[PDB]
């Protein structure tokens, strides 16, 4: 039991590590949205310029 | 065609022969940019997201 329990615990870091893995890139994707936002607030662009914003 | 620079139906494009016809021939051009730039915006904002996805 104490060798199988540890390869349960083995594999149960694994789970966590991939769920992780999705989580990367779903923060980077937020962090983009968060770098365009300061470009939009701007004061200078058109609806037609912001709204290049909004496609992306 | 499509830009608005030239008629689906007649099939005639923009032309410079005249003074007058000049004058009108500037604000097409402009709207006839804007679609391009529109259209770079989204082929511009899929492969953003396709080197995100890429990348997770």
């Known amino acids: 039991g104490l060798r199988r329990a540890e390869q349960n615990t083995e594999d149960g870091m694994s789970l966590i590590?991939?769920?992780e893995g999705y989580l990367?890139?779903?923060?980077?994707?937020?962090?983009?949205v968060r770098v365009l936002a300061?470009?939009?607030?701007?004061?200078?662009?058109?609806?037609?310029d912001r709204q290049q914003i909004q496609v992306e | 065609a499509a830009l608005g620079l030239r008629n689906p139906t007649v099939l005639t494009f923009i032309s410079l022969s005249t003074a007058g016809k000049a004058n009108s021939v500037i604000?097409?051009?402009?709207?006839?940019?804007?679609?391009?730039?529109?259209?770079?915006?989204?082929?511009?904002?899929?492969?953003?997201?396709?080197?995100?996805?890429?990348?997770?």
């Open chain 1, 17 to 19: 590590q991939t769920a």
């Open chain 1, 24 to 32: 990367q890139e779903t923060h980077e994707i937020v962090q983009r």
């Open chain 1, 38 to 48: 300061v470009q939009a607030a701007n004061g200078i662009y058109s609806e037609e």
């Open chain 2, 27 to 56: 604000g097409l051009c402009d709207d006839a940019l804007r679609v391009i730039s529109k259209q770079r915006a989204d082929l511009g904002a899929y492969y953003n997201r396709m080197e995100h996805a890429a990348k997770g």
